[PDB]
Amino acid sequence: GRKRRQKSMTEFYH
């Protein structure tokens, strides 16, 4: 799993 979730601005997977 993932304890710390950081919203990646590069989350736009082209």
Amino acid at the residue 8: S
Residues found in the chain: 14
Q: Structure tokens of 4?
A: 């710390």
> What string of H, E and C letters represents the secondary structure of the chain?
CCCCCCCCCCCCCC
Q: Which residue shows structure tokens 């736009």?
A: 12
Question: What technique was this entry resolved by?
Answer: NMR
Q: How far apart are CA 2 and CA 13, in angstroms?
A: 20
Q: Structure tokens of 12?
A: 């736009």
Question: How many CA atoms lie within 13 Å of 9's alpha carbon, on the beta-carbon side?
Answer: 0
Q: Structure tokens of 7?
A: 């919203």
